[PDB]
Amino acid sequence: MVNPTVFFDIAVDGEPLGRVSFELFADKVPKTAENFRALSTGEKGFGYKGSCFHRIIPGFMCQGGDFTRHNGTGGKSIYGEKFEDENFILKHTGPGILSMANAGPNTNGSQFFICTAKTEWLDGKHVVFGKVKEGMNIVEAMERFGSRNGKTSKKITIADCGQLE
Amino acid sequence: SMTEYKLVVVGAGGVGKSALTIQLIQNHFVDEYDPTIEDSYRKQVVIDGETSLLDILDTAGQEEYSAMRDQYMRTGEGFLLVFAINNTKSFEDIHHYREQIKRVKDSEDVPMVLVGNKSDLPSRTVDTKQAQDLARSYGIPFIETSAKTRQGVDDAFYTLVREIRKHK
Ligand SMILES: CCn1c(-c2cc(N3CCN(C)CC3)cnc2[C@H](C)OC)c2c3cc(ccc31)-c1csc(n1)C[C@H](NC(=O)[C@H]1C[C@@H]1C)C(=O)N1CCC[C@H](N1)C(=O)OCC(C)(C)C2
Ligand SMILES: Nc1nc2c(ncn2[C@@H]2O[C@H](COP(=O)(O)OP(=O)(O)NP(=O)(O)O)[C@@H](O)[C@H]2O)c(=O)[nH]1
Ligand SMILES: [Mg+2]
């Protein structure tokens, strides 16, 4: 019943940057939290390890999680290719919010985004399910590799990821 | 130097704005859906014997950001109004895009081309007659396209350039 914590070890063009940890709100969105947890451990034989943050827009968010096509269009959940919006109880209140990317209603896969600002217009459209716990300065450091339309200027990867005890 | 034309591609999400632009620029067909934030491209072409530089703005169909279009509409010189022939909603959205462009540019005489895309698909829901009648009422050309087969891709962009030339 304790919310799980997971980590990303971030690399920039293969060089280490630092660790970001996340609390996953299993107490409010258990199905969505469990998807992200399992994808962070890789326990289903696939997951976030080695994937990129393909879209970084300074002032707004860092987005990643396409481990199936590695081009921003793919990803899959542990429940099938996609799964439904669990709930919209939690809001995009500020920096550090962890939320699901999607292509419209009930199309959650593995892609996610980390807010670097309040993005309230996404409330009720993207499922919020966690928050940065440690290493927000790593996410802040990732922003300078982004741009207005999100194209990145260096390859920002999840070099390693897993669940913390 | 060759004249430059600022073309803007608009229309509802998923209608094929990016697939059309990438076909024009790179001569291949993106089959995956990579929804656009905003992308810009440049290509030189020859149209009616005159070499021209196309500056193409490929815009977001993402409809929650409809309040963000005024500046690129002010800057753009001509507009491809894109719908998909198998998506009646995208055809209905066309009027809103045209009205927004005319309003933002404060003019009844803006170069535009109506583009009905995905003409390779069998699931047609918008009659060619409906599209031709609409374009006739707007006073603009109508081009049927497929980004998958390349049918009409050059014609749509080149026709828009011809519309811009007539406007100057
Ligand atoms: C108007 C220009 N624009 C803008 C925009 C908006 C503003 N303001 C709005 C709020 N007001 C109050 C202030 C001004 C200012 N500046 C810009 C940008 C910087 O101007 C260039 C956005 C945006 C998003 C999309 C398209 C165009 C867009 C888009 C296109 S697909 C999409 N969203 C949703 C996206 N699905 C996917 O990736 C699918 C493919 C995978 C599976 C998705 O799940 N996520 C996660 C959440 C964030 C979102 N991506 C994204 O990237 O948001 C970018 C952001 C900048 C936050 C919003
Ligand atoms: N069969 C077929 N599919 C097409 C055609 N044009 C685009 N598509 C497909 O439709 C989907 C969406 O196309 P895309 O060009 O990304 O559309 P968009 O208008 O740019 N979307 P957005 O506004 O989100 O950026 C993709 O899977 C693409 O391959 C076409 O002429 N024929
Ligand atoms: Mg596009």
Does B37 touch chain A if contact means CB atoms closer than 8 Å?
A: yes
**Catalytic residue list contains A92:** no
Number of domains in chain B: 1
Could you give the CA distance from residue B49 to residue B57 in angstroms, rounded to a whole number?
Answer: 24
CATH classification at residue B109: 3.40.50.300
CATH classification at residue A65: 2.40.100.10
Number of domains in chain A: 1
Could you tell me which residues come within 8 angstroms of residue A2 by beta carbon, excluding any fewer than 6 positions away?
none
B35 chain-A contacts, CB cut-off 8 A: 103
Q: What is the DSSP string of B132-149?
A: HHHHHHHT--EEE--TTT
Kindly state the DSSP code that residue A10 receives in the 8-state scheme: E
* Helical packing angle, B128-138 and B88-105, nearest 10°: 10
β-strand partners of A6: A22, A163
Using the mean position of ligand 1's atoms as its centre, give its distance from the Cα of residue B37 in Å.
Answer: 6
- Tokens standing for residue A62: 């860092």
Buried b (16+ CB within 10 A) or exposed e, B107-138: eeebbbbbbbbbbeeeeeebeeeebeebbeeb
Residue of B nearest to A70 (CA): B34
Resolution in A: 1.6
User: Residue A10 belongs to what domain range?
Assistant: 5-164
Q: Do B35 and A57 touch (CB under 8 A)?
A: no
User: Residue B146 belongs to what domain range?
Assistant: 3-167
Ligand at shortest distance from the CA of A115: 1
- Determined by X-ray
Residue of B nearest to A73 (CA): B34
